[PDB]
Structure formats: structure tokens, C-alpha cells
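Reagents: none. Just compute today. Big defensin.
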Amino acid sequence: PAIYIGATVGPSVWAYLVALVGAAAVTAAN
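Predicted 3D structure written out:
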């Protein structure tokens, strides 16, 4: 269901999506 079966976020996997999106945000900037 979609009521309270997702009250989490993920601290680790989060820092991973941040470091990755960072390198791409620094390579697209001329």
C-alpha cells in the first residue's frame, strides 16, 4: 500500500546520489 510503508529515506544511498550528481554538475559547467 502507500500509507506508512515508506516512512524512511536512506542516509547512505542518499550521500551516494549526492556525490554522483555533484561530479556531473561540475563537468557540465564550461
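Helices lie at 11-27.
Action item: order primers for follow-up constructs.
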